[PDB]
Amino acid sequence: NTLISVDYEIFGKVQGVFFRKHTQAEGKKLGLVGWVQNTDRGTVQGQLQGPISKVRHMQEWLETRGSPKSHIDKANFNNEKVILKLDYSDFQIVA
Numbered sequence: 001n002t003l004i005s006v007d008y009e010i011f012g013k014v015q016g017v018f019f020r021k022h023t024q025a026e027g028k029k030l031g032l033v034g035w036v037q038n039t040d041r042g043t044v045q046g047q048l049q050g051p052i053s054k055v056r057h058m059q060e061w062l063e064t065r066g067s068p069k070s071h072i073d074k075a076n077f078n079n080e081k082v083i084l085k086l087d088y089s090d091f092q093i094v095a
Contacts, residue, residue: 004052005034005087006080010044010062012073019044020093022067030054033088037095046094049086 010019015038023036023044031054036046044066048055062075 003083005049005083007047007078009076013071014044017067017069019067019070024091024093026061027091030058033086033091035092035094
């Protein structure tokens with residue numbers, strides 16, 4: 001009953017706009033676990049883990065919406081993989 005993990009990195013106007021707060025909220029709403037963090041190249045990165053359909057909904061959110069004041073240029077997804085079990089028990093803002 002298939003769980004996946006995927007890494008993400010979001011490019012655009014994504015800092016100074018409460019991106020991490022909104023990402024955590026949306027991930028939790030979708031029953032996802034993982035994490036979100038700001039990077040030193042100005043992007044937002046993290047991992048998403050959960051059922052495929054929920055992860056995919058979140059991937060879409062990360063492509064077009066993000067936080068209200070944000071302007072997303074590109075969401076890069078990497079290392080999509082099936083997992084035996086969740087590696088996380090919550091969705092953390094790493095900060």
